[PDB]
Amino acid sequence: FKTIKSDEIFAAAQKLMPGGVSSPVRAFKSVGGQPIVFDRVKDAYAWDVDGNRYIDYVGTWGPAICGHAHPEVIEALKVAMEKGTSFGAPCALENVLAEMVNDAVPSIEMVRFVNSGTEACMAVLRIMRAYTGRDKIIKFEGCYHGHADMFLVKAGSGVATLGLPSSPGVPKKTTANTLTTPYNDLEAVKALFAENPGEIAGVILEPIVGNSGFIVPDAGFLEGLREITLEHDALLVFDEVMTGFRIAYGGVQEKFGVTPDLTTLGKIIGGGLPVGAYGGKREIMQLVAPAGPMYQAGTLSGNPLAMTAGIKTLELLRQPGTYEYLDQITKRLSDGLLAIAQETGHAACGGQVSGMFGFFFTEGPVHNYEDAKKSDLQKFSRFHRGMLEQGIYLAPSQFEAGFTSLAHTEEDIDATLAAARTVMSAL
Amino acid sequence: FKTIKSDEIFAAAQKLMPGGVSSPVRAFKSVGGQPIVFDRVKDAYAWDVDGNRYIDYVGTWGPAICGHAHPEVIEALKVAMEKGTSFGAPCALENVLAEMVNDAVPSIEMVRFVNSGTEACMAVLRIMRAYTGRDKIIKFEGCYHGHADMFLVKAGSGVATLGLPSSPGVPKKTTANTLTTPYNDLEAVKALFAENPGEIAGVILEPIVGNSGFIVPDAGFLEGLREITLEHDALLVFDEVMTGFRIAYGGVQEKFGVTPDLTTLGKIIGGGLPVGAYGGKREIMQLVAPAGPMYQAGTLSGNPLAMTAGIKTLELLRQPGTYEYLDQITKRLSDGLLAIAQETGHAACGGQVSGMFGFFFTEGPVHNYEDAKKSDLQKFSRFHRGMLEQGIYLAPSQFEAGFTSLAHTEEDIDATLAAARTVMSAL
Ligand SMILES: Cc1ncc(COP(=O)(O)O)c(CNc2cccc(C(=O)O)c2)c1O
Ligand SMILES: Cc1ncc(COP(=O)(O)O)c(CNc2cccc(C(=O)O)c2)c1O
Known part of the structure; x- marks a missing residue:
């Protein structure tokens, strides 16, 4: 998993902009401090400046519900x-x-x-x-x-x-x-x-x-x-x-x-x-x-x-069927992730409503910010990095919801669950 | 000078948005109340939704220094x-x-x-x-x-x-x-x-x-x-x-x-x-x-x-020569406007620095907001409307600077001065 180009660009960025980013969360501070620089995005994918392709669950933080570059x-x-x-x-x-x-x-x-x-x-x-x-x-x-x-x-x-x-x-x-x-x-x-x-x-x-x-x-x-x-x-x-x-x-x-x-x-x-x-x-x-x-x-x-x-x-x-599709693929994703967590022995909770989901490394349930803070950020950090290496791009933060788009296919979901199983099996 | 289409659209806009605009000044409140709805812009011109063409001196309030749709x-x-x-x-x-x-x-x-x-x-x-x-x-x-x-x-x-x-x-x-x-x-x-x-x-x-x-x-x-x-x-x-x-x-x-x-x-x-x-x-x-x-x-x-x-x-x-050009054509415009004011018997003052200018209907000079307020807003209103009818689009406000772009030609300036002379000759 090479990130050479992303590292170069981000290193340079830090000298030009505060934290080398236009927005805080992008610095990956809460998850290791190694952000990847995007070159392009399309449908449900994002491409590294290193050629790595990811199934994107950030959707530029909400806007790309129809899929990137529709x-x-x-x-x-x-x-x-x-x-x-x-x-x-x-x-x-x-x-x-x-x-x-x-x-x-x-x-x-x-x-x-x-x-x-x-x-x-x-x-x-x-x-x-x-x-x-x-x-x-x-x-x-x-x-x-x-x-x-x-x-x-x-x-x-x-x-x-x-x-x-x-x-x-x-x-x-x-x-x-x-x-x-x-x-x-x-x-x-x-x-x-x-x-x-x-x-x-x-x-x-x-x-x-x-x-x-x-x-x-x-x-x-x-x-x-x-x-x-x-x-x-x-x-x-x-x-x-x-x-x-x-x-x-x-x-x-x-x-x-x-x-x-x-x-x-x-x-x-x-x-x-x-x-x-x-x-x-x-x-x-x-x-x-x-x-x-x-x-x-x-x-x-x-x-x-x-x-x-x-x-x-x-x-x-x-x-027709826009939100039904989003709910469908996201529930699949959400439930799948939770099942895998159960199966792999990791305490977890989460949920989804339409194309918006959450996954916490804590038995929860989470009703407020205080509950959310009980999440194992250490584990999340490793999980996030592990998924990244498996080609899955998740919000670089335990405190940001994840997103689904009309471009994500059932196959993208399965590939994500396969990746999740592989990653959580370790941790 | 027809503005039928602009009026229709603006009338409808007022029911959908506060003052029928996304930004206060666009409402023409202090200059007539009949804003014109743009359809497209290019170089130094703007086109009415009615087909009227104007030499634009607003430049979408600053951004279009290189000219519209460069x-x-x-x-x-x-x-x-x-x-x-x-x-x-x-x-x-x-x-x-x-x-x-x-x-x-x-x-x-x-x-x-x-x-x-x-x-x-x-x-x-x-x-x-x-x-x-x-x-x-x-x-x-x-x-x-x-x-x-x-x-x-x-x-x-x-x-x-x-x-x-x-x-x-x-x-x-x-x-x-x-x-x-x-x-x-x-x-x-x-x-x-x-x-x-x-x-x-x-x-x-x-x-x-x-x-x-x-x-x-x-x-x-x-x-x-x-x-x-x-x-x-x-x-x-x-x-x-x-x-x-x-x-x-x-x-x-x-x-x-x-x-x-x-x-x-x-x-x-x-x-x-x-x-x-x-x-x-x-x-x-x-x-x-x-x-x-x-x-x-x-x-x-x-x-x-x-x-x-x-x-x-x-x-x-x-x-090369970007700012020299802006200063050149804008001084010409600024001085020309003032000469015409003098010639037509209207008290006025103003100035320009690069592609930014101002013209007040007051002998001035203007050193601050208080001075600026002494301007004859009544006259400005008539002047602005008169120029509009002559195909010149100026900021619908005595308190907004005017702008020049690299797309404005010497001819555009002359056409503007010709229009200015015509308008001030009346007033
Ligand atoms: C509920 C809510 N309200 C307002 C905003 C702000 O919109 P703008 O960000 O366009 O000014 C949000 C933002 N959502 C959000 C989530 C994660 C990171 C970032 C980031 O600025 O990098 C933003 C939000 O999630
Ligand atoms: C000196 C100066 N500082 C800040 C602003 C604000 O940036 P934004 O407007 O992008 O939020 C200005 C704005 N300049 C300006 C002048 C006339 C119209 C309008 C309008 O909001 O309709 C804006 C400005 O002229």
């Missing part, structure tokens, strides 16, 4: 760029994607496109407060919604990995307006409102957690949150940047039947390009400039390329 | 997307653009790519504090650095144009750490440090303002800022999202010889795609995760398409 998406992009990649003015495509998104997401009646999940979260945090006139926000430990100053507290992703809580970087004051609670803990939340009457603008959370490993909400959790927010005139915000269009066309809110007031979207909506979006009830979205006083802008927001990619992606997802 | 850029993109548009893992292209950026920008020794100017400014605000251990920041009235909460104080760009106050939704606790001072007012700045000993993390500003109309720094302003920051161990941050690669390959810092500690980049660096970047002294950048404790991530950061576009764009800018 023929129809690239062709649509090839045609659209002939007209220019950015206008700085309205374009008909913004209207199209906007309509598609409104129809697809229950809670969304009005949408504002931005360039990333981070911008969307940042913006949604602002109207939550702008709309309610309150400053406190409730977020859960292990959840990740981008980074900022008064919000980066016990976040997920690169944060909920090395035990990193909040900051550094933000002032020891801003975060005071951000309340934290354990995921799946309704009581903790009620306690927070009880302790801050008329001060909570709302609760934001990943309807299904993907940034502290894969964690599904316990029965009644989402419903409880919806009920309590309504009770205290607080907003319920679903960060579906990762779950949106993956768990279901309408996301977790559609799947589990709970409608938030505001929703953030990203990844898939961009079909591979930088795109974010936030929308919700019209009355709330009305405060967004130029319609309302809350300012939020973006030079490249709604650019024709991103819109084209998003539109083509959503169109592909609307085809 | 052949070499679109071809590079066509080839790159065959390999996929996003990896979610390191790619060789990140190293390439990173190296190019480090070489181009004096202050930048290490870079972190992000997806927008907003993310770059947001991130840079965070290490300023992380690095100095101080919470207060100094920004100038009229300057715009994205919509990160801390920056929504006396903001320019869309806030100014829309006559919006400091945006709501941002906790007083957070805005309290943003200290403001009029641009070009060194004394006000010194007073701020004097009043907040050991509390100022640094000063951030547009080396050359473009978001409160075009405003150049008075002699000694930038130098003074550099000196005072050094004196109080505070950081000097240049937001060159707009000026970067436009005023000069190395930006204003290169042109005017003043080196900041951190620099934010955007627009042009993305060559038409969503891209942002922040870099500066290595010792400061070292705090950025995964190298340091300050967390900042981005799913699509450093994606291969953006990198490709940025690389090709920078390569074109490195060609």
Whole structure:
């Protein structure tokens, strides 16, 4: 298993960029510190800069649900760029994607496109407060919604990995307006409102957690949150940047039947390009400039390329049996991995919902970030490296959910289980 | 002059998106309210969804310095997307653009790519504090650095144009750490440090303002800022999202010889795609995760398409006589506009530096936001509409700088002056 070229490039990268990466998790710090540099991706595969081919379960962290470099998406992009990649003015495509998104997401009646999940979260945090006139926000430990100053507290992703809580970087004051609670803990939340009457603008959370490993909400959790927010005139915000269009066309809110007031979207909506979006009830979205006083802008927001990619992606997802196929191959994968773990004598737990799955090296079950942290990271590290050598690319972190795509075939799944058996047989 | 199609689309957009736009300024609020929907752009022109053709001076707000849909850029993109548009893992292209950026920008020794100017400014605000251990920041009235909460104080760009106050939704606790001072007012700045000993993390500003109309720094302003920051161990941050690669390959810092500690980049660096970047002294950048404790991530950061576009764009800018040409045609434009104003009896002032210019309907001179506000917005509105009808597309705002590109020809300039003469002769 040669990684000579990846090592060269990554070594050089570290001299040009912090940690030699554009994003923390890519440094493979939580799993050995030896990242592989991709050269190209297609369908369900990724190719090393060394020629190694992998069955990819990261899907560029969510966007590639239709498979990498989907023929129809690239062709649509090839045609659209002939007209220019950015206008700085309205374009008909913004209207199209906007309509598609409104129809697809229950809670969304009005949408504002931005360039990333981070911008969307940042913006949604602002109207939550702008709309309610309150400053406190409730977020859960292990959840990740981008980074900022008064919000980066016990976040997920690169944060909920090395035990990193909040900051550094933000002032020891801003975060005071951000309340934290354990995921799946309704009581903790009620306690927070009880302790801050008329001060909570709302609760934001990943309807299904993907940034502290894969964690599904316990029965009644989402419903409880919806009920309590309504009770205290607080907003319920679903960060579906990762779950949106993956768990279901309408996301977790559609799947589990709970409608938030505001929703953030990203990844898939961009079909591979930088795109974010936030929308919700019209009355709330009305405060967004130029319609309302809350300012939020973006030079490249709604650019024709991103819109084209998003539109083509959503169109592909609307085809028959899309989510059934994802659930089918992912359950197979998820169950298979767990069986192999049982068979090989390794304590493990996990689950999957549509093309999103999780696998922890702990008997669990995992209901929150604290549970997730009991996972044997040492073993995960060896497992991840072992799978890599077997040609399987998994999230270089125990705290990141895995992803499946419409391009993954039954054979890819079997090849992955064969690889998993081989790897866990060792460990 | 028909705009039937634009009106239809914009009317529909307002029902789907706040103000029917992805970004405030595009709404034409302060210039007529009838924005025009672009269909395509090419070279120095833009085409209405109604068939109207315009000589574009907005350049999608900065990115299109090489001209819209530059052949070499679109071809590079066509080839790159065959390999996929996003990896979610390191790619060789990140190293390439990173190296190019480090070489181009004096202050930048290490870079972190992000997806927008907003993310770059947001991130840079965070290490300023992380690095100095101080919470207060100094920004100038009229300057715009994205919509990160801390920056929504006396903001320019869309806030100014829309006559919006400091945006709501941002906790007083957070805005309290943003200290403001009029641009070009060194004394006000010194007073701020004097009043907040050991509390100022640094000063951030547009080396050359473009978001409160075009405003150049008075002699000694930038130098003074550099000196005072050094004196109080505070950081000097240049937001060159707009000026970067436009005023000069190395930006204003290169042109005017003043080196900041951190620099934010955007627009042009993305060559038409969503891209942002922040870099500066290595010792400061070292705090950025995964190298340091300050967390900042981005799913699509450093994606291969953006990198490709940025690389090709920078390569074109490195060609001989690039900036000489921009200065040449823009001075011609700037002077011409002023002569016509004089000739037609309209009070006016403005200026240009490279492919960036400004034109105010006020005798001025304009040294700061307060001066800029003295402009006759009524007249500007009529002027802008009049030019539009003559086939010239200008920023729909008196408070936004205008832009020139390598695709604009001497003839385009003359046609613009001819149009200008015609329009101002009326008014
Ligand atoms: C639930 C959730 N909300 C917001 C974001 C942010 O969108 P952007 O990243 O486009 O600003 C996420 C991100 N999901 C995610 C997961 C793992 C790594 C990374 C990484 O930045 O390298 C990102 C997320 O998972
Ligand atoms: C100096 C400066 N700094 C930061 C930004 C922000 O980058 P993004 O806009 O990529 O988030 C700018 C923006 N410049 C600008 C000017 C006019 C329109 C718009 C608009 O959002 O519609 C943006 C800017 O001009």
